[PDB]
Amino acid sequence: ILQHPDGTVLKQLQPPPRGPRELEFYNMVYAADCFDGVLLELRKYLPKYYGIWSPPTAPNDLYLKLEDVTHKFNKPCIMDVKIGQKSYDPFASSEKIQQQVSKYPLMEEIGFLVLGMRVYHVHSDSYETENQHYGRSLTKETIKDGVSRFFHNGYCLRKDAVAASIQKIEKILQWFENQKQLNFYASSLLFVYEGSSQVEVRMIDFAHVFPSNTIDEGYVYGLKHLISVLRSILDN
Numbered sequence: 240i241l242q243h244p245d246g247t248v249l250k251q252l253q254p255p256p257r258g259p260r261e262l263e264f265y266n267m268v269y270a271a272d273c274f275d276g277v278l279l280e281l282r283k284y285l286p287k288y289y290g291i292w293s294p295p296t297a298p299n300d301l302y303l304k305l306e307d308v309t310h311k312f313n314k315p316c317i318m319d320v321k322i323g324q325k326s327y328d329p330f331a332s333s334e335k336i337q338q339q340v341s342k343y344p345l346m347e348e349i350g351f352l353v354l355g356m357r358v359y360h361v362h363s364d365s366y367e368t369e370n371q372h373y374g375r376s377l378t379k380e381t382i383k384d385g386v387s388r389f390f391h392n393g394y395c396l397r398k399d400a401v402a403a404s405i406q407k408i409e410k411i412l413q414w415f416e417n418q419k420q421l422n423f424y425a426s427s428l429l430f431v432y433e434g435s436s437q438v439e440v441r442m443i444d445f446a447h448v449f450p451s452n453t454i455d456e457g458y459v460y461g462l463k464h465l466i467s468v469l470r471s472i473l474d475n
């Protein structure tokens with residue numbers, strides 16, 4: 240991700256078939272002639288899409304031009320959470336499946352994985368960053384406190400941001416409860432809240448979204464478990 244000062248991000252297409260699939264996803268969703276009520280509703284929860292972009296002198300070099308969801312914040316606290324029971328898609332080989340489950344074998348049990356967080360600390364006037372190893376080290380014992388850490392800001396636990404996150408996730412859950420046409424593997428929720436002394440939840444990362452004729456039960460499971468953890472944190 241490259242943050243552009245104009246309030247967009249440039250995401251370089253991943254190698255094929257992943258990058259091309261993510262392009263086609265955005266193209267289908269934001270199709271100008273699209274009057275599919277499900278897909279029109281979905282736009283609310285995605286970064287706004289500005290189309291394929293490549294440098295003037297390099298047509299080979301493909302990016303997606305997306306809304307920077309953090310742009311309206313002064314000191315954004317950002318957490319990326321991969322959603323679902325399976326990080327591998329319906330067309331994964333035995334090795335690929337093994338690779339993906341190996342990356343985090345608790346995915347079926349938990350239904351989500353913290354990919355990373357960036358948390359502004361008022362007292363320090365500085366950022367605390369967690370990488371992929373943080374979330375992958377979280378067990379069932381430690382997942383609540385693992386998530387809680389994101390909301391330690393402003394000399395307190397930010398229960399306001401926790402509550403807001405629940406309410407916004409619930410809207411995304413409601414969308415998933417009323418669509419049977421897309422299944423989402425290895426996609427994320429991007430959480431943002433304001434860390435400054437003076438909330439966004441968006442769906443991102445669509446290299447493994449596939450047509451379906453059933454409920455995306457793994458994604459729903461993830462959302463519901465995430466909501467339950469967040470709910471529990473409100474009792475801290």
Ligand SMILES: FC(F)(F)Oc1ccc(-c2onc3ccc(-c4nnn[nH]4)cc23)cc1
Pocket residue numbers: 240248250286305306307308309317357429443444445
């Ligand atoms: F550390 C930091 F770079 F600042 O953290 C940041 C800052 C900004 C974003 C961010 O903002 N709007 C986004 C829209 C899409 C994506 C995206 N799509 N697929 N993969 N990532 C990321 C987006 C993400 C992380």
